Ligand binder design. Structure first.
Ligand SMILES: N#Cc1cnn2c(=O)cc(Cc3ccccc3)[nH]c12
Ligand SMILES: N#Cc1cnn2c(=O)cc(Cc3ccccc3)[nH]c12
Ligand SMILES: *Cc1c(COP(=O)(O)O)cnc(C)c1O
Ligand SMILES: *Cc1c(COP(=O)(O)O)cnc(C)c1O
Ligand SMILES: [Cl-]
Ligand SMILES: [Cl-]
Ligand SMILES: [Cl-]
Ligand SMILES: [Cl-]
Lengths: 358, 356
């Protein structure tokens, strides 16, 4: 397996630049002037290219639409005061993208070439990256199969493309969650730990049920012991005093039903570095949370992920009865600290190797 | 709201493609006919259905069909009888299944009989692509996809329904049975025909090939239940532990795709009334024991593409189990094939066939 090369980039600037949006942006609805595109076939990878944001033209038998040979990434770029733009830990997104590619028998590529191409693309649309407090550029790489045939097999054609959305988003607002064991997001030996499109379509109906029932997100439970796995599209963390009397930050381990989040890892890294309390990757059950809540040992429950960064939870609707989560009562101190450090790093206030300059 | 066949627009092709040569083999799903059906949906409701030349789709880069697998499909066959009459096999069931799939993915509802008529109209237009050599047919592939130009994970406000056709052209297969592989789970979506269920199986199928097997026998649960064979339902014909001769296939408890061929085989066998016909869990342990006790007669997969597919070998981890399907006729398999053929090619008129 060869790889496309960033040296071979082909650039084509738009003939009529689009009018940028300070006003209300909906997430993922406004895109920039350009996009990256690379084609793969039996002759390997073609030359990458930046081109005006434009429609895909696909054979109607394309395996991307019949058998979900499709995977994506999500990461952010932040514009610092000094008008410099930085990507947050992009190497980890490239790492995960490649593992996802392998799981779906899609073509391998060089993580650094893709990153260089993405850098080049963001450079070209530098000015779309906003700089108002708490804003960023969302980067959405995608790799889809494109075999024009109905056989369920390893494709001999593929498209890799990348589009960009400017986004907005410090009054951290807590959410309520529906926790219903009938809905299972992922299973051991499945593909829940890869960022494949097939993992997301089925959750749309589940999220609608959570809205009809007065909740804002889904808390995905797993196992007959009802383990807390994820919140919506976010990893979940619990800050509590554990059954053994020790203050800790816990998140479920990567046993196959958890998507390894970049924010998740970064929160673990940060907490470990501070050395101020126990940081552990351990299974969390509803039984354990209820008991900890009845003994007042829970301080904060929250989600982590690129879009929200850190999202507090204040209520869980479980077994038809509502559980209050005292997250906001506790500051939320941990949440606020995490947000501030990430913000200082992301907007270049503290220099840090996690940031990748555009 | 629904599209109506009465409103169909027809655009005939100006560039007809050459039909498959007489000395050229039809590889499954690579050759398409000249026309396709196309129906779009948005906040205004369903647009007009069109039969139009086979052509590429134009998709926004953010299309939810490509990021969050808002996609489902179907698979059914049209058969040309000696009288040159083309007929669809139990299409109402595919239409039923397609709508359930759509509901599961918050994709727009449509009228089943309206789509069936549009599909009939489409096949009528391309009727000369329907082959007539024995064991040949026309594969019909309806597809419904969300098409929201937005990265939000939510109910799409636009969708695209299309149908394409492929002309398509009892030798036993070996199966890899390894509990490491899971196709579906209770509380998942294995019982719907959604694109997301198939992509993850490509690597597993490569693993079966590497290990010298032709298909994957999908196992589920601590007790290693036999669920499906590749993209087919699985059936076992044996003398059960209570000494009774039966045809068993797994029940529809969430991890099984309700196949049309499967339902048809249950219906036929129930009608005969010559042996016990049941839907029940089947475990590797039950199979292993029945094999050493010489109780297994035939094991086979069922599905639209193969109809009935015999199994001769199962590689369970490292044990190679011989399945005596072919040493037993295979009597039931042949019987099913013979009866299906009579119904499908119009030899014997039947309510299961829908005339085109
Ligand atoms: N973080 C976060 C978050 C909360 N809602 N939300 C959304 O509703 C959508 C996204 C984008 C996304 C991220 C990962 C997988 C699929 C889609 N992110 C988020
Ligand atoms: N029957 C059958 C059979 C055996 N192999 N096979 C294939 O390799 C492909 C198909 C078409 C199909 C059917 C259902 C889901 C996805 C694809 N069918 C079959
Ligand atoms: C993308 C994703 C996350 C979080 O990922 P980040 O890399 O932190 O943005 C968590 N859970 C699921 C299910 C996801 O798809
Ligand atoms: C389509 C399908 C079947 C069988 O379907 P028929 O309706 O009989 O063609 C069985 N299993 C799986 C996994 C399928 O996708
Ligand atoms: Cl990093
Ligand atoms: Cl992992
Ligand atoms: Cl019927
Ligand atoms: Cl069912």
């Amino acid at each position: 397996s060869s790889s496309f090369k960033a040296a071979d980039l082909q650039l084509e600037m738009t003939q009529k630049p689009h009018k940028k949006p300070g006003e209300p942006l909906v997430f993922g609805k406004t895109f920039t002037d350009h996009m990256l595109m690379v084609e793969w076939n039996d002759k390997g990878w073609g030359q990458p290219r930046i081109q005006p944001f434009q429609n895909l033209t696909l054979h109607p038998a394309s395996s991307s639409l019949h058998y979900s040979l499709q995977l994506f990434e999500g990461m952010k770029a932040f514009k610092g005061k000094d008008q410099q733009v930085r990507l947050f830990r992009p190497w980890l997104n490239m790492d995960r993208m490649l593992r996802s590619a392998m799981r779906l028998c899609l073509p391998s590529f060089d993580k650094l070439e893709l990153l260089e191409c993405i850098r080049r693309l963001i450079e070209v649309d530098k000015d779309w990256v906003p700089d108002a407090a708490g804003t960023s550029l969302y980067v959405r790489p995608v790799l889809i199969g494109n075999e024009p045939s109905l056989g369920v097999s390893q494709p001999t054609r593929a498209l890799l493309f990348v589009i960009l959305c400017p986004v907005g988003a410090g009054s951290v607002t807590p959410v309520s969650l529906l926790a219903d064991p009938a809905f299972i997001r992922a299973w051991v030996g499945g593909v829940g730990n890869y960022k494949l499109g097939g993992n997301y379509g089925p959750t749309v109906l589940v999220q609608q049920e959570a809205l009809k029932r007065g909740c804002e997100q889904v808390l995905w439970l797993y196992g007959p012991d009802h383990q807390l796995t994820e919140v919506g599209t976010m990893n979940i963390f619990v800050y509590w005093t554990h059954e053994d009397g020790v203050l800790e930050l816990v998140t479920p381990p990567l046993n196959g039903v958890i998507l390894p989040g970049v924010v998740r890892q970064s929160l673990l890294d940060m907490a470990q570095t501070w050395g101020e309390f126990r940081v552990v990757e351990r299974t969390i059950t509803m039984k354990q949370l209820l008991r900890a809540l009845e003994e007042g040992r829970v301080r904060e429950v929250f989600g982590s992920g690129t879009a929200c960064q850190v999202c507090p939870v204040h209520r869980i609707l479980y077994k038809d009865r509502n559980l209050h989560i005292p997250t906001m009562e506790n500051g939320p101190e941990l949440i606020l600290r995490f947000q501030k450090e990430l913000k200082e790093i992301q907007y270049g206030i503290r220099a840090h190797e996690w940031m990748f300059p555009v």
